[PDB]
């Protein structure tokens, strides 16, 4: 009901397709930079040289507190990659706790398909664990430094707010995109209860999905398939990504449920937009999707349910017309499930590192209609859940 973390509430900007970022400063004197919040990696890095898609960048020669680790680093992601130089420097977060810490920083010197034209961010904050950090787990991630060096609780929470309609660059810059509450939980960001799922292993923020429903109908697959490889929560991935086999069955089911309207394969492949006359998007013909996650109590699970208002990503019309257009934001994966931005926009997500668990609650800013809402409900009796984890 209350919350109580006002200095951090509304400190994010951006959208699902270009990422959500937070303002940070690095160096002495402070150099202001926009940093993408990414729970799918563990390296804090920043553009350290001119780039066509960068308005500004980190200038080590201008920071009196900069320290050179004399070591290069290479970081590849599902899509995009970069190369940089390791060092450390003082870091702060204007709309975050009032502390300054010395953290590791990769000064990006070369990159490919990493930076995005007009996203307005110039660096990335890898919020996951050391295990996946490059070059290796000896490079302490930013959040580990923060906790070790201050009294900020070992926990952060994220409320990513999708608009439900497209935003030009002027709008994205002028609008609040959400909240990243460092060291706490703000009750003003959600409704209902918070349900927690265990973090399987501390590397990516890994979880276990035990069941999947499309409009209440069991996708009915061997639950290991749902985590075939792994299942992670990643704010830096736009789409809800599913293992190929799961994806194929899910799309078959979503197609059957929305069959009152036919759409081209390019749409289901997430390649082309679909448009409807202003205000007539037929939300009701699309099904809700429910992901069941392992609970903290034995044989207990809970589910999170999203609407098409979450999985249909708003995009401006090819002709910038007055139609309401979207792309299908669910796609296949050969590297496990990725609960990306479009899924996170439906919920307030608590990354409780201290208790090795992740919490979900209906977001106070999720998009919906007058007939349906996102939901987080439980408990459900589920047996042999760990069996769902892939080894």
């Amino acid at each position: 009901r209350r919350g109580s973390f006002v200095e951090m509430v509304d400190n994010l900007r951006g959208k699902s397709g270009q990422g959500y970022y937070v303002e940070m400063t690095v160096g002495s004197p402070p150099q202001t930079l926009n940093i993408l919040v990414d729970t799918g990696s563990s390296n804090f890095a920043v553009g350290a040289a001119p780039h066509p898609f960068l308005h500004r960048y980190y200038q080590r020669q201008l920071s009196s507190t900069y320290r050179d680790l004399r070591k290069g680093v290479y970081v590849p992601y599902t899509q995009g990659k970069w190369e940089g130089e390791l060092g450390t420097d003082l870091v702060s977060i204007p709309h975050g706790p009032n502390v300054t810490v010395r953290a590791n920083i990769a000064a990006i010197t070369e990159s490919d398909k990493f930076f995005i034209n007009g996203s307005n961010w110039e660096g990335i904050l890898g919020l996951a664990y050391a295990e996946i950090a490059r070059p290796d787990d000896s490079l302490e991630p930013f959040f580990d430094s923060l906790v070790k060096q201050t009294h900020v609780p070992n926990l952060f929470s994220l409320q990513l707010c999708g608009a439900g309609f497209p935003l030009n660059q002027s709008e994205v810059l002028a609008s609040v995109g959400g909240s990243m509450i460092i060291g706490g939980i703000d009750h003003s960001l959600y409704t209902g209860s918070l349900w927690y799922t265990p973090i399987r292993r501390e590397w990516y923020y890994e979880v276990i999905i035990v069941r999947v429903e499309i409009n209440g109908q069991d996708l009915k697959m061997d639950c290991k398939e749902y985590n075939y490889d792994k299942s992670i929560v990643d704010s830096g991935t736009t789409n809800l990504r599913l293992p190929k086999k799961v994806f194929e069955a899910a799309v078959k089911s979503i197609k059957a449920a929305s069959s009152t309207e036919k759409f081209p394969d390019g749409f289901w492949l997430g390649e082309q937009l679909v448009c409807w006359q202003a205000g007539t998007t037929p939300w009701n013909i699309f099904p809700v999707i429910s992901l069941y996650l392992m609970g903290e109590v034995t044989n207990q699970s809970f589910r999170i349910t999203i609407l098409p208002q979450q999985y249909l990503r708003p995009v401006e019309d090819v002709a910038t017309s007055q139609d309401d257009c979207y792309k299908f934001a669910i796609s296949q994966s050969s590297t496990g499930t990725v609960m990306g931005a479009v899924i996170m926009e439906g919920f307030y997500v608590v990354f409780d590192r201290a208790r090795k668990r992740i919490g979900f609650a209906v977001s106070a800013c999720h998009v919906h209609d007058e007939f349906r809402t996102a939901a987080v409900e439980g408990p459900f009796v589920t047996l042999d859940m760990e069996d769902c984890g892939y080894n």
């Binding site: 599902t78 995005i116 931005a341």
Partner: peptide, 7 residues
């Protein structure tokens, strides 16, 4: 359009 690390 974002797909942020490989292990």
């Amino acid at each position: 359009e974002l797909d942020x690390v490989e292990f």
